[PDB]
Each structure stands twice: as C-alpha cells, then as structure tokens.
Design an enzyme around this catalytic site. Structure first.
Site, PDB file in Angstrom:
ATOM      1  N   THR A  64      -7.508  -5.471   2.731  1.00  0.00           N
ATOM      2  CA  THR A  64      -6.628  -6.421   3.387  1.00  0.00           C
ATOM      3  C   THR A  64      -5.682  -6.775   2.224  1.00  0.00           C
ATOM      4  OG1 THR A  64      -7.877  -6.684   5.089  1.00  0.00           O
ATOM      5  CG2 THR A  64      -6.289  -8.255   4.736  1.00  0.00           C
ATOM      6  N   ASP A  78      -8.911  -5.806  13.301  1.00  0.00           N
ATOM      7  CA  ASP A  78      -9.802  -5.699  11.993  1.00  0.00           C
ATOM      8  C   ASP A  78     -11.281  -6.439  12.562  1.00  0.00           C
ATOM      9  OD1 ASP A  78     -10.332  -5.090   9.036  1.00  0.00           O
ATOM     10  OD2 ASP A  78     -10.662  -7.166   9.530  1.00  0.00           O
ATOM     11  N   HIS A 135     -14.727  -4.316  12.800  1.00  0.00           N
ATOM     12  CA  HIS A 135     -15.926  -4.591  11.660  1.00  0.00           C
ATOM     13  C   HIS A 135     -17.242  -4.803  12.718  1.00  0.00           C
ATOM     14  CE1 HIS A 135     -14.426  -4.842   7.924  1.00  0.00           C
ATOM     15  NE2 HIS A 135     -13.527  -5.450   8.270  1.00  0.00           N
ATOM     16  N   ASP A 185      -2.047  -2.995   7.808  1.00  0.00           N
ATOM     17  CA  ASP A 185      -2.416  -2.877   6.537  1.00  0.00           C
ATOM     18  C   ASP A 185      -3.361  -1.798   5.938  1.00  0.00           C
ATOM     19  OD1 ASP A 185      -4.485  -4.059   7.888  1.00  0.00           O
ATOM     20  OD2 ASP A 185      -4.955  -5.725   6.461  1.00  0.00           O
ATOM     21  N   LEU A 242       2.356   6.647 -16.889  1.00  0.00           N
ATOM     22  CA  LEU A 242       3.780   6.792 -17.468  1.00  0.00           C
ATOM     23  C   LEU A 242       3.608   7.813 -18.440  1.00  0.00           C
ATOM     24  CD1 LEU A 242       5.086   3.131 -17.361  1.00  0.00           C
ATOM     25  CD2 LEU A 242       5.321   4.728 -15.707  1.00  0.00           C
ATOM     26  N   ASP A 299       3.175   9.256 -22.195  1.00  0.00           N
ATOM     27  CA  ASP A 299       2.936   8.740 -23.560  1.00  0.00           C
ATOM     28  C   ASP A 299       4.158   9.037 -24.303  1.00  0.00           C
ATOM     29  OD1 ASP A 299       0.513   7.927 -22.322  1.00  0.00           O
ATOM     30  OD2 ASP A 299      -0.750   9.345 -23.690  1.00  0.00           O
TER      31      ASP A 299
HETATM   32  C1  LIG Z   1       5.306   0.369 -10.758  1.00  0.00           C
HETATM   33  O1  LIG Z   1       6.298  -0.673 -10.861  1.00  0.00           O
HETATM   34  C2  LIG Z   1       6.097  -1.540 -11.913  1.00  0.00           C
HETATM   35  C3  LIG Z   1       7.524  -2.489 -11.810  1.00  0.00           C
HETATM   36  O2  LIG Z   1       8.286  -2.065 -12.439  1.00  0.00           O
HETATM   37  C4  LIG Z   1       6.083  -1.064 -13.402  1.00  0.00           C
HETATM   38  O3  LIG Z   1       5.391  -1.883 -14.076  1.00  0.00           O
HETATM   39  C5  LIG Z   1       6.332  -2.287 -15.017  1.00  0.00           C
HETATM   40  O4  LIG Z   1       6.063  -1.617 -16.240  1.00  0.00           O
HETATM   41  C6  LIG Z   1       6.538  -1.751 -17.449  1.00  0.00           C
HETATM   42  C7  LIG Z   1       5.709  -0.901 -18.680  1.00  0.00           C
HETATM   43  O5  LIG Z   1       4.286  -0.737 -18.409  1.00  0.00           O
HETATM   44  C8  LIG Z   1       6.362  -3.441 -17.788  1.00  0.00           C
HETATM   45  O6  LIG Z   1       7.275  -3.629 -18.807  1.00  0.00           O
HETATM   46  C9  LIG Z   1       6.715  -4.501 -19.747  1.00  0.00           C
HETATM   47  O7  LIG Z   1       7.249  -5.745 -19.513  1.00  0.00           O
HETATM   48  C10 LIG Z   1       6.411  -6.796 -20.508  1.00  0.00           C
HETATM   49  C11 LIG Z   1       6.720  -8.312 -19.979  1.00  0.00           C
HETATM   50  O8  LIG Z   1       5.854  -8.211 -18.795  1.00  0.00           O
HETATM   51  C12 LIG Z   1       6.175  -9.787 -18.108  1.00  0.00           C
HETATM   52  O9  LIG Z   1       7.333  -9.874 -17.373  1.00  0.00           O
HETATM   53  C13 LIG Z   1       7.400  -9.223 -16.190  1.00  0.00           C
HETATM   54  C14 LIG Z   1       8.794  -9.713 -15.843  1.00  0.00           C
HETATM   55  O10 LIG Z   1       8.834 -10.810 -14.826  1.00  0.00           O
HETATM   56  C15 LIG Z   1       6.396  -9.338 -15.188  1.00  0.00           C
HETATM   57  O11 LIG Z   1       6.339  -8.491 -13.977  1.00  0.00           O
HETATM   58  C16 LIG Z   1       5.049  -8.949 -15.928  1.00  0.00           C
HETATM   59  O12 LIG Z   1       4.026  -8.814 -14.907  1.00  0.00           O
HETATM   60  C17 LIG Z   1       2.734  -8.319 -15.426  1.00  0.00           C
HETATM   61  O13 LIG Z   1       1.806  -9.288 -16.175  1.00  0.00           O
HETATM   62  C18 LIG Z   1       1.181 -10.285 -15.370  1.00  0.00           C
HETATM   63  C19 LIG Z   1       0.320 -11.182 -16.320  1.00  0.00           C
HETATM   64  O14 LIG Z   1       0.980 -11.251 -17.617  1.00  0.00           O
HETATM   65  C20 LIG Z   1       0.825  -9.909 -14.077  1.00  0.00           C
HETATM   66  O15 LIG Z   1       0.424 -11.145 -13.062  1.00  0.00           O
HETATM   67  C21 LIG Z   1       1.482  -9.065 -13.255  1.00  0.00           C
HETATM   68  O16 LIG Z   1       0.683  -8.377 -12.313  1.00  0.00           O
HETATM   69  C22 LIG Z   1       1.767  -7.720 -14.100  1.00  0.00           C
HETATM   70  O17 LIG Z   1       0.656  -7.049 -14.914  1.00  0.00           O
HETATM   71  C23 LIG Z   1       0.825  -5.812 -14.649  1.00  0.00           C
HETATM   72  O18 LIG Z   1       1.698  -5.417 -15.343  1.00  0.00           O
HETATM   73  C24 LIG Z   1       1.269  -5.496 -17.104  1.00  0.00           C
HETATM   74  C25 LIG Z   1       2.237  -5.110 -18.132  1.00  0.00           C
HETATM   75  O19 LIG Z   1       3.352  -6.083 -18.021  1.00  0.00           O
HETATM   76  C26 LIG Z   1      -0.200  -4.724 -17.326  1.00  0.00           C
HETATM   77  O20 LIG Z   1      -0.725  -5.030 -18.520  1.00  0.00           O
HETATM   78  C27 LIG Z   1      -1.240  -5.244 -16.009  1.00  0.00           C
HETATM   79  O21 LIG Z   1      -2.358  -4.501 -16.317  1.00  0.00           O
HETATM   80  C28 LIG Z   1      -0.583  -4.925 -14.703  1.00  0.00           C
HETATM   81  O22 LIG Z   1      -0.481  -3.521 -14.525  1.00  0.00           O
HETATM   82  C29 LIG Z   1       4.991  -9.644 -17.105  1.00  0.00           C
HETATM   83  O23 LIG Z   1       4.707 -11.057 -16.996  1.00  0.00           O
HETATM   84  C30 LIG Z   1       6.966  -6.398 -22.071  1.00  0.00           C
HETATM   85  O24 LIG Z   1       6.395  -7.519 -22.880  1.00  0.00           O
HETATM   86  C31 LIG Z   1       6.806  -5.022 -22.485  1.00  0.00           C
HETATM   87  O25 LIG Z   1       7.474  -4.612 -23.405  1.00  0.00           O
HETATM   88  C32 LIG Z   1       6.373  -4.306 -24.956  1.00  0.00           C
HETATM   89  O26 LIG Z   1       6.373  -2.806 -24.792  1.00  0.00           O
HETATM   90  C33 LIG Z   1       7.342  -2.232 -25.537  1.00  0.00           C
HETATM   91  C34 LIG Z   1       7.021  -0.682 -25.894  1.00  0.00           C
HETATM   92  O27 LIG Z   1       8.178  -0.023 -26.341  1.00  0.00           O
HETATM   93  C35 LIG Z   1       8.016  -2.925 -26.763  1.00  0.00           C
HETATM   94  O28 LIG Z   1       9.314  -2.353 -27.402  1.00  0.00           O
HETATM   95  C36 LIG Z   1       7.849  -4.201 -26.844  1.00  0.00           C
HETATM   96  O29 LIG Z   1       8.426  -4.811 -28.115  1.00  0.00           O
HETATM   97  C37 LIG Z   1       6.684  -4.912 -26.196  1.00  0.00           C
HETATM   98  O30 LIG Z   1       5.485  -4.281 -27.189  1.00  0.00           O
HETATM   99  C38 LIG Z   1       4.996  -5.824 -27.781  1.00  0.00           C
HETATM  100  O31 LIG Z   1       4.009  -6.143 -27.179  1.00  0.00           O
HETATM  101  C39 LIG Z   1       2.882  -5.140 -26.913  1.00  0.00           C
HETATM  102  C40 LIG Z   1       1.736  -5.646 -25.760  1.00  0.00           C
HETATM  103  O32 LIG Z   1       1.388  -6.836 -26.052  1.00  0.00           O
HETATM  104  C41 LIG Z   1       2.485  -4.916 -28.348  1.00  0.00           C
HETATM  105  O33 LIG Z   1       1.397  -4.031 -28.400  1.00  0.00           O
HETATM  106  C42 LIG Z   1       3.284  -4.532 -29.275  1.00  0.00           C
HETATM  107  O34 LIG Z   1       2.731  -4.022 -30.758  1.00  0.00           O
HETATM  108  C43 LIG Z   1       4.423  -5.543 -29.380  1.00  0.00           C
HETATM  109  O35 LIG Z   1       4.214  -6.799 -29.629  1.00  0.00           O
HETATM  110  C44 LIG Z   1       7.183  -3.996 -21.122  1.00  0.00           C
HETATM  111  O36 LIG Z   1       8.691  -3.890 -20.978  1.00  0.00           O
HETATM  112  C45 LIG Z   1       6.421  -4.367 -16.712  1.00  0.00           C
HETATM  113  O37 LIG Z   1       5.981  -5.654 -16.985  1.00  0.00           O
HETATM  114  C46 LIG Z   1       5.639  -3.843 -15.469  1.00  0.00           C
HETATM  115  N1  LIG Z   1       5.866  -4.685 -14.310  1.00  0.00           N
HETATM  116  C47 LIG Z   1       4.857  -4.909 -13.298  1.00  0.00           C
HETATM  117  C48 LIG Z   1       5.309  -5.889 -12.103  1.00  0.00           C
HETATM  118  O38 LIG Z   1       3.874  -4.519 -13.347  1.00  0.00           O
HETATM  119  C49 LIG Z   1       4.875   0.219 -13.164  1.00  0.00           C
HETATM  120  O39 LIG Z   1       4.989   0.971 -14.518  1.00  0.00           O
HETATM  121  C50 LIG Z   1       5.138   1.100 -12.047  1.00  0.00           C
HETATM  122  N2  LIG Z   1       3.942   2.351 -11.909  1.00  0.00           N
HETATM  123  C51 LIG Z   1       4.280   3.471 -12.091  1.00  0.00           C
HETATM  124  C52 LIG Z   1       3.337   4.309 -11.950  1.00  0.00           C
HETATM  125  O40 LIG Z   1       5.505   4.063 -12.082  1.00  0.00           O
HETATM  126 CA   LIG Z   2      -7.164  -5.823   6.566  1.00  0.00          CA
HETATM  127 CA   LIG Z   3       1.041   6.313 -20.755  1.00  0.00          CA
HETATM  128 ZN   LIG Z   4     -11.403  -5.668   7.339  1.00  0.00          ZN
END
Ligand SMILES: *[C@@H]1O[C@H](CO)[C@@H](O[C@@H]2O[C@H](CO)[C@@H](O[C@@H]3O[C@H](CO[C@H]4O[C@H](CO)[C@@H](O)[C@H](O[C@H]5O[C@H](CO)[C@@H](O)[C@H](O)[C@@H]5O[C@H]5O[C@H](CO)[C@@H](O)[C@H](O)[C@@H]5O)[C@@H]4O)[C@@H](O)[C@H](O[C@H]4O[C@H](CO)[C@@H](O)[C@H](O)[C@@H]4O[C@H]4O[C@H](CO)[C@@H](O)[C@H](O)[C@@H]4O)[C@@H]3O)[C@H](O)[C@H]2NC(C)=O)[C@H](O)[C@H]1NC(C)=O
Ligand SMILES: [Ca+2]
Ligand SMILES: [Ca+2]
Ligand SMILES: [Zn+2]
Ligand SMILES: Cc1noc(-c2cnc(N[C@@H]3Cc4ccc(Cl)cc4C3)nc2)n1
Ligand SMILES: [K+]
Ligand code: NA
Length: 805
Positions: A160, A262, A266, A309, A690, A692
C-alpha cells in the site's frame, strides 16, 4: 507530544491548513495524531439521520445537527445529502444518465481550471472491472464513458504505502524512500511501521508529492490522507463542501481513499463470496460523489481518476516457507516477512554473520522451493529495487500464493487470512485499475496497460503544473488525454561519432589473438568496400543510430550483417544493431574459426581488447554481440570475429548468451516476421539504474583496462502488424527487451544443469525490461528516426513484455 484539546473546532471543520501543536486540530488527520479539539466529533462528524434525503425531509427547516441537509438552503450552503436533487427535485442519479461526450469543460463561473479528484481504492485488483461489473454500475459507467486501461502495473513491492506514495510522486520506492510497509533505516537507527507514530516523521517521505507540487505552483490542494474512523460518506461530503468554497480558498485537487476492497480481500481472498458487498459499497460511494458533482453542476467540469494501489492474491497460512528449515543460525538474522523477504544481521556486533553463507543455504535447497534469494543488486532491473539503504542486501522474491516466515511460531503467535499482496509487480493478481473521466480525458477510449509511475506527470498536466523530476516518461501517456498534452523534444545528441576508415596494418596489433583467415576477386572487392562504408546500414539500423547523451569517444563501424557504436573508452560496443529476416538461416562456427579473433584495421591497437588478457583471466571468457551463427555468408562470418565485436563473458553466462544467439533470435524472427536486434553491455556497479562512469567500475578483465559489464541487454523490435516484415514496416512497432545479469554462475536458475531449452528463456523472461530501463543504464536514446509520432515512441519505450497468460 502534548495537545491543548480545550480549543474548539467551531467554524474549522476539515480546515485545510493544519495547525502546530500544542494547538488542537480539526483537519481530516487530527484523529491519527490523537490531537482533535474536544468538540471535533460533535461538530465535524455529525451522523444524525444518516446520509440520504427521504421525501419527508424535502424542504425541512435546517437542523444543524443533521449529518447532511435536505432544506431549500442546502445547495447554497454546499451541504445537501448527495441524493437531495434526486429525492426532492425530480433529478436522475448520474449513473442513470446517458454517456455524453465532454468535448469542453462545462464549469461554473469562477472555476479557473477543471478540478481533479483522485478516487483511490486499496487492493482493487484489475480483474474486478470485468468480474464485478454487474454490481458496480457507477464505476462501469466511468470506465466505459471515459478513458480506461485493462490494467495498471503497480511498483514492487506491491504494498500500500510504496504504491500510494509512487502515485503521489512519480518515483520508484527506492527513490521516494517508502520501500515497504515496514522499514529500518540504519542511518536514523529508526523503524517505520503501519502501527505507531514513527511513520508520521517527514524524514521517511522523499520526493515531492502532488499536493506539494501544486501548493508550490499556486494550485490549492485538499488534504489527501483520511483518518480510518472518518466514514466514507463524510469524506465525500467534505470534498463536496470544499468544492463550494469561494474561488480564492477552493482547492483544485482532491483525493478520496477507500481501505476496501483490500480489508475484506485479506480476510476472504480476492474472489471470496464476501467480496461482492465491498465492491457494491465502493460503487455506491462513487455514485454519491458523481450525484454530488451533478448537484454542484461540476459533473462535466471535474476530471475524476479512479485508481488502485495493487491487487490481491490467494494466500493461506499453510503456504508459508520457514527459514528455520534452511538456516542453522536462524536466531542470528532479522527477517522482514510475508510476500517478500528482507534479511539482515540481528546484531551489527556479530562478526560471525556472513551473507554469502545465508544466500547459499537458501539457494535451490528444496525441489519446489517457493522463494528465491537474491543479493539486491541481482534482482531483475525492472523492479528498480536496490538503491536505498533501507533495502536490505539480502532479498527473497516469494512465489505468488506464498509467504516466507522465520519460524513456524511466527504464523500462529501473530489460519486467519485468505488474501495478500506484495509479490513481483508483473504478477497478474497484483495488477490494479485506472479510469480517467472528464473533459481532459478522451471519450470511450481504451489505452494499453501502463505503469503507475507515469500518472504523476499526467496529474501535473491536468492541473497545469510542472512536475518535479520523476521516473515517468513525460509524454508517454499523452494518448489518454484530449488536451493538456505534453509535447517533448527528443534529447540532443551530446557525442558525435567518428567514422574511421582503414588506418592500421595487421602487424601493428600485438593482441595475442589468432585467426585462420588467410584465404584470398574484383566483383567481391568493391562489394566488401561498400559494406564497410554502410551500403547495408538501412537494413540493419532501422530506427536511426542511437544517440549518445553523454560526453565520450566512439566510432560507427559498418559491416555486411551489423552496425555498431564502438566505445574507445570501454573498448567495446555501446550498441550493436542487426536485422534477421524470417528467411534467415542459422549456421555453425566452423571448426577452424572456434578461437578466431581478428584485429579491426579501423581501430587502433591501443583502443582494442586483447586475447592475452582473456587467456590469463582464468574466470573470464568472451562472446560476441553480433552472433556468428547468423552470418549472411561464410565470407561475412569473418566480420563477426572482429575484436571490436568481442565482449567479456563468464563461461556460465556464455551458456545463456549462446542459446539466445543460436536458437532464440531465429525463433523470434520466425514468430514476428523478422526482428531488429540491438544488443550491448551495461555497467551498473552502484545499482542506481544509471550508466556508470569509468571510475565506478569494480571489475576488469585481469591485467587489462577491459571493464566487465554487470548486464547484457537486447532490444528486439518488429512490426506490430506481423504481415509486414521488420525491415519494411509502415506502421506502429512491437518491442520486447531484456537486461540479463552477467553472473559467473547460474545459481539463479535451479534447473541450469539441464539443457538451455529448459531454463534459459525462463531466465530471460524474469529479466524482461523496458527500452527506457536500458536508456537509463546506457545513456543512449533509441528510435530517433522512425515514421512514428514522438509520443507514440515514448509509449513504446515504456512498454514491458510481461509473459503472463
Ligand atoms: C528516478 O527519478 C529520480 C528523480 O529524478 C532520480 O533520482 C535523482 O537522481 C540523481 C542521481 O542519483 C540525484 O541527484 C543527486 O542529488 C544530490 C542532492 O540530493 C538531495 O536533494 C534533492 C532535491 O530536493 C532530493 O530529492 C534528494 O532526495 C534524496 O535523499 C533524501 C535523503 O537525503 C531522501 O529522503 C529521498 O528519498 C532521496 O533519496 C534517494 O536519492 C538519494 C540520492 O540523492 C539516494 O542516496 C537514496 O538511496 C534514494 O534513492 C536529496 O535530499 C546531489 O548531492 C548529488 O551530486 C553528487 O554527485 C555528483 C556526481 O558527479 C557530484 O558532481 C556532486 O559533487 C555530488 O558528489 C559529492 O557527494 C557524493 C555523495 O555524498 C560524494 O561521494 C562525492 O565524493 C562528493 O562530495 C546528485 O545530483 C537526485 O537526488 C535523485 N533524486 C531523488 C528524488 O531520488 C532517479 O535516478 C531516477 N531513477 C532512474 C532509474 O532513472
Ligand atoms: Ca493497499
Ligand atoms: Ca550506476
Ligand atoms: Zn492489503
Ligand atoms: C491507517 C491508514 N492506512 O492507510 C491510510 C491512508 C492511506 N491513504 C490515504 N489517502 C491516499 C494517499 C494518496 C496518495 C496518492 C494518491 Cl494519488 C491518493 C491518495 C489518497 N489516507 C489514508 N490510513
Ligand atoms: K579466460
Ligand atoms: Na543453477
């Protein structure tokens, strides 16, 4: 958290802005936080005289104690019982009116846009639309008069909160963070559950849900969550009252939620005889809403979405597997159980814990085993279920109709239940529903099944909102819409190819390769030159070159039988494209060419693989992207042994790949009247879905810079009208694709000791993929040059071939 419940809800019932503790609340969630003002039940949850007008109430003196009104002033107050005009004013129920096309919105003065009402139903299995049709007339009218899909695919896990939050955000659960109905976050050291207060903490909920996207762009939203004790009738009345607010105060977007069917599913199973009444009751609620909209003159103004859902499967306590029957150490693990499993160490202080021994103890240990263990990175890529710290490294994919539990006492110190959900989102029982009705949706239109991750974009389009970044493909659902379509441009190509000619002599190469190819005609000399410059390219590249959407160095290589885009950075093709007609013949690799690898005189030795590295790497072998089995002629077959067509393959994986190339490609060409194949590698060592970069690669062929793919893909395209061959198709296309894991064992396939004919296609079907999945993983953009509309191509790229009956 203390609340001053001594405040009053007077004039604030179902107020839209929630107030800060310690102040008492009057919103549709105050009950859930134990925070309603002391008089909320009395003022806001009136029940007197129930929910329906009767002839005797018609034109009554208003009594403010009544749940709803039948007084002459009720339409102006916005608080009539929903059947008021039917009982008191001679009107028809909405369901009794003929379907009449809504070509334009027909809205009251002061409406800036058609409102959107999302009517969400929990556990509403796709097949209820047909199987329940006789008892759901309001829903059958929405479905037949509006836009409907035969089913909508939920996200995994088919639970859900993951699915409702995906509907709200357009994100996969691994991205929005709601990865189950139960979760542990090791960074927070905090547990999320269905019961209790931790689940209200905002840190769990990532992305940007629709009500926040709206509010940030100046579109007002109703509160989407309803406390369970608020009766459905009151939820409907609350929505209709909000739609009577002044223009500046009135929301444009609203949600209704039903816990049914739902809750009953169940208890009774998906098709238990007890399920008819819940379906009838949901239908009556839809009829209250539509009658209420008709009273407000909004029934030809509002867009209504009817969406579920997830579905519901037959599951009984007796169909439970117990980890205590596999593991010696069962007390050293924590299991998240049920229709999926997630395993982690019970203590992070236990240095005896070993994931590899747990996986091995759970792998093909019992002949009819009803779950399969995976390290999360090895899960089918189409589940997009790995890139979150809340998803445990060890996953169990449970067979439909089954549960997993840690030990038997968990099942009887917790049979009761006959239904459950959570399984693989391609499972038919898990599919749910979509209907769109209103001015913005098409009239009496069927659309193909689609994924629930696409709906956020559409809901944003309906409201005039720019969607937050999400996992939908914006435009792929334009064919649902009469207007408000989103018209995207194709991404710009970032890297242009090089077109190398003959630049290197054979003796410049010291690759440690050999080939028995020293066999020597001016007829066939011009011809081989034309094939190397691309004279057959229109046959083998049917939809244009894939565009490379990142900065890299690559070469287009032409051949008689195939075209490739060869990466000078990764030393192998990014893609290899070839067409196999229905008439094509399969052949052998001749005995004298078994180990043949041939330098490519268009590509420098320094940008080539070498055979020595494969000889020295005792674990790694090689295969070819264009299959030598499908060569057009003996002479053309030499091209298939070019070093530029070679890719690193574990022996175990070459079993799968050689069966695909030698048997299955020709089978598909036979069945589909030719196929076009695009194959290539994928590198996703950080399991983020994504492409590498080079510095993320964890494994190379020993002693070399040859990176090892984590997966191999194929995109297999043909004519939807299979009376036309793949290479002369005038109309829409048909695609199937896969993303096969590049594994050093076939431990996933419990029948792998048997002939490939008994297990390889089953593996491939589990790893079915969308073209869009492959685009994310490769940074390539396919189908750039077709005769089809770009929105049609976007729908094609989101298609999943599911292989359900
Ligand atoms: C599906 O669609 C989504 C949405 O478009 C895609 O996800 C995006 O992917 C991008 C790449 O993976 C990612 O961009 C990064 O953003 C970082 C900032 O993130 C914060 O801000 C945004 C905006 O408000 C926010 O949405 C983020 O939300 C995540 O994290 C919070 C908790 O912190 C969670 O509540 C939330 O659920 C979400 O978690 C998810 O995403 C994170 C990654 O952000 C995962 O780790 C989780 O597991 C979960 O999946 C954040 O609050 C930004 O900081 C990044 O930039 C770094 O990398 C580049 C590489 O070149 C570098 O240039 C930068 O300098 C920086 O590197 C430095 O930090 C590194 C890490 O600490 C370090 O190792 C280095 O050495 C450096 O110091 C990056 O741009 C974007 O956040 C997400 N957004 C979302 C909503 O998930 C997704 O890819 C799509 N899927 C497919 C398969 O297509
Ligand atoms: Ca449900
Ligand atoms: Ca990858
Ligand atoms: Zn259920
Ligand atoms: C206890 C208990 N357990 O669950 C609930 C509950 C679940 N859902 C809602 N509302 C949904 C959330 C949502 C998300 C997205 C869209 Cl598109 C529509 C909707 C309506 N209200 C309550 N209460
Ligand atoms: K080897
Ligand atoms: Na096996």
């Amino acid at each position: 958290p203390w609340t001053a419940t001594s405040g009053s809800c007077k004039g604030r019932c179902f107020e839209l802005q929630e107030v800060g503790p310690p102040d008492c609340r009057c919103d549709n969630l105050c009950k859930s936080y134990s925070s309603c003002c002391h008089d909320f039940d009395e003022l806001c949850l009136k029940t007197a005289r129930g929910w329906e007008c009767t002839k005797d109430r018609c034109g009554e003196v208003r009594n403010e104690e009544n749940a709803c009104h039948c007084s002459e002033d009720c339409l102006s107050r916005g608080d009539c019982c929903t059947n008021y005009q039917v009982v008191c004013k001679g009107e028809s129920h909405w369901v009794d009116d003929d379907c009449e096309e809504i070509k334009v919105p027909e809205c009251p003065a002061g409406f800036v846009r058609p409102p959107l009402i999302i009517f969400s139903v929990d556990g509403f299995r796709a097949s209820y639309m047909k199987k329940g049709s006789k008892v759901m007339p309001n829903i059958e009218k929405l479905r037949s008069c509006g836009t409907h899909a035969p089913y909508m695919r939920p996200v995994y896990p088919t639970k859900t909160f993951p699915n409702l939050y995906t509907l709200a955000t357009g994100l996969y659960p691994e991205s929005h963070g709601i990865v189950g109905n139960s979760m542990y976050d090791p960074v927070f050291d905090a547990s999320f559950h269905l019961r209790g207060r931790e689940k209200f903490n905002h840190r769990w909920w990532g992305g940007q849900p629709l009500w926040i996207t709206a509010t940030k762009q100046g579109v007002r939203a109703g509160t989407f969550f309803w406390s369970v004790s608020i009766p459905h009738e009151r939820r409907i009345l609350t929505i209709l009252q909000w739609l009577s607010l002044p223009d500046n105060e009135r929301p444009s977007v609203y949600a209704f939620y039903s816990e049914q069917p739902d809750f009953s599913g169940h208890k009774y199973g998906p098709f238990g005889p007890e399920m008819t009444n819940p379906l009838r009751e949901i239908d009556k609620t839809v009829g209250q809403l539509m009658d209420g909209l008709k009273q407000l003159r909004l029934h030809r103004c509002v867009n209504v979405i009817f969406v579920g859902d997830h579905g519901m499967e037959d599951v009984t306590c007796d169909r439970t597997e117990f980890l205590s029957n596999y593991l010696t150490n069962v007390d050293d693990i924590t299991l998240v159980p049920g229709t999926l499993g997630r395993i982690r160490a019970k203590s992070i202080n236990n240095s005896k814990y070993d994931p590899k021994t747990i996986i091995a103890a759970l792998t093909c240990k019992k002949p009819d085993q009803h779950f399969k263990p995976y390290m999360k990175q090895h899960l089918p890529k189409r589940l997009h279920y790995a890139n979150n710290r809340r998803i445990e490294d060890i996953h169990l994919l449970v067979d439909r109709r089954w549960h997993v539990a840690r030990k038997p006492l968990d099942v009887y110190k917790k049979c009761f239940f006959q239904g459950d959900h959570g399984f693989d989102n391609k499972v038919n029982s898990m599919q749910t529903v979509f209907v769109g009705y209103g001015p913005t949706f098409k009239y009496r239109t069927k659309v193909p099944p689609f994924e629930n991750i696409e709906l956020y974009n559409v809901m944003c389009d309906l409201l005039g909102l720019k969607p937050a970044p999400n996992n939908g493909t914006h435009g792929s659902l334009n064919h649902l819409l009469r207007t408000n379509t989103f018209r995207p441009t194709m991404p710009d190509e970032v890297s242009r190819p090089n077109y190398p000619g003959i630049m290197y002599l054979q003796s410049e190469f010291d690759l440690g390769c050999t080939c028995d190819d020293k066999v020597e005609n001016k007829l066939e000399e011009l011809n081989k030159r034309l094939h190397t410059k691309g004279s057959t390219k229109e046959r083998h590249l049917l939809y244009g070159r894939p565009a490379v959407l990142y900065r890299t160095s690559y070469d287009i290589l032409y051949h008689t039988d195939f075209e490739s885009g060869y990466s000078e950075i990764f030393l192998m093709p990014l893609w290899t494209s070839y067409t196999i007609s229905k008439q094509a013949e399969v052949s052998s690799i001749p005995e004298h060419l078994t180990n043949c690898v041939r330098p490519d005189v268009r590509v420098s030795p320094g940008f080539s693989q070498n055979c020595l590295a494969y000889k020295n790497d005792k674990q790694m072998s090689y295969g070819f992207l264009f299959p030598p089995y499908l060569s057009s002629s003996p002479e053309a077959k030499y091209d298939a042994f070019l070093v530029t067509n070679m890719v690193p393959m574990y022996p175990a994986f070459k079993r799968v790949w050689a069966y695909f190339q030698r048997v299955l490609v020709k089978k598909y060409a036979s069945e589909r009247n030719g196929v076009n194949v695009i194959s290539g590698p994928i590198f996703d060592y950080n399991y983020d879905g994504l492409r590498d970069t080079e510095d993320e690669i964890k494994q190379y062929v020993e002693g070399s810079s040859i990176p090892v793919p984590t997966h191999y893909y194929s995109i297999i395209t043909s004519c939807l009208d299979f009376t036309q061959p793949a290479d002369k198709c005038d109309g829409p296309l048909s695609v199937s694709s896969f993303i096969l894991p590049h594994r050093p064992d076939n431990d996933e396939s419990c029948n792998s000791s048997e002939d490939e004919s008994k297990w390889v296609e089953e593996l491939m079907k589990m790893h079915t993929a969308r073209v869009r999945d492959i685009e994310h993983l490769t940074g390539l953009d396919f189908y750039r040059k077709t005769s089809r509309s770009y929105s049609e191509i976007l729908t094609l790229k989101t298609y999943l071939h599911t292989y359900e009956s």
